């Protein structure tokens, strides 16, 4: 493997520890690294590491080589799981990122729901959450990234509660129709999910087409039905979701559109 000056980091000053909230990532540890912030060489930090699994192929190894590689030429951004280094010499290929210690968003809503039924988590607290994965989503696809799977489940949330897009490079409820049974993925697809995103932040981590069988969603679909408004859903919101979801991916909002709306609500949303 190639030695890059710009990422090596050395392993004696990665201490490994427990896996990160258990396998959804593919072989994820968390890490405390020395010096990871070269102002303090001393100062220890926490990261998560992913490797290969002992029983992994030659193509397994590619796979993560090429992650490695589209993290390296992305560059940074607050909302992204960013690349923080690369341990490739005389050892297994371990590679750094940055660590989401309070899990998924989906799984961060569900735990924040109100107890009991319906006869702590506002809605300015709901739209700031879009609005940074829309910040995320409107930087991925500046450096000519499509995500593929944009659901609450991959957006990590940190110890500062800061949204982070994971895993950006079948989940047939978030899917765009196009990408349905064409087999496309566009920017215009990822749009599509960014919609049914905003459903299930607003229904606090809710299943989307809840109770419709998968096979049933893409005659649901054909015939023009969406989901309904979520309980507590802004109609800003809900008109929002309703853009994403159009047949024609041309006349779907851009992520810059989106960041545009989104900043308008944050700013002037009441309750
Ligand atoms: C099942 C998901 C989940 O909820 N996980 C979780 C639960 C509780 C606490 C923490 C977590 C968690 O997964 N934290 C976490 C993972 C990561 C890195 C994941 C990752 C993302 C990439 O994006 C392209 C790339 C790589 O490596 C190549 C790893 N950070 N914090």
Not at 155 to 166: G, H, R, S, Y
Not at 171 to 178: G, L
Request: aromatic share 8%.
């Amino acid at each position: 493997l190639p030695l890059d000056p710009l990422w090596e980091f050395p392993r004696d000053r990665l201490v490994l520890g427990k896996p990160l909230g258990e396998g959804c990532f593919g072989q994820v540890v968390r890490a405390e690294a020395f010096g990871m912030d070269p102002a303090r060489p001393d100062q220890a930090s926490t990261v998560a590491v992913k490797m290969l699994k002992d029983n992994a192929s030659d193509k397994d190894l590619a796979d993560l080589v090429s992650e490695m590689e589209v993290m390296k030429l992305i560059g940074r951004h607050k909302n992204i799981i960013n690349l923080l280094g690369v341990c490739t010499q005389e050892g297994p290929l371990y590679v750094i990122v940055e660590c989401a210690a309070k899990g998924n968003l989906r799984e961060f809503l569900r735990a924040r729901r109100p107890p009991g039924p319906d006869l702590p988590l506002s809605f300015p607290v709901l739209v700031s959450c879009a609005y940074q994965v829309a910040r995320g989503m409107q930087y991925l696809e500046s450096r000519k990234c499509i995500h593929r799977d944009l659901a609450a489940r991959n957006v990590l949330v940190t110890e500062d509660n800061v949204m982070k897009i994971a895993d950006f490079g079948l989940p047939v409820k978030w899917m765009a129709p196009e990408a349905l049974f064409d087999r496309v993925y566009t920017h215009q697809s990822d749009v599509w999910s960014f919609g049914i995103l905003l459903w299930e932040i607003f229904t606090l981590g809710g299943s989307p087409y809840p109770g419709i069988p998968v096979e049933e969603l893409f005659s649901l679909l054909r015939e023009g039905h969406r989901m309904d408004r979520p309980p507590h859903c802004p109609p800003e919101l809900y008109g929002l979701m309703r853009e994403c979801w159009h047949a024609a991916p041309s006349q779907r909002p851009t992520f810059k559109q989106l960041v545009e709306a989104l900043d308008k609500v944050l700013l002037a949303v009441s309750e």
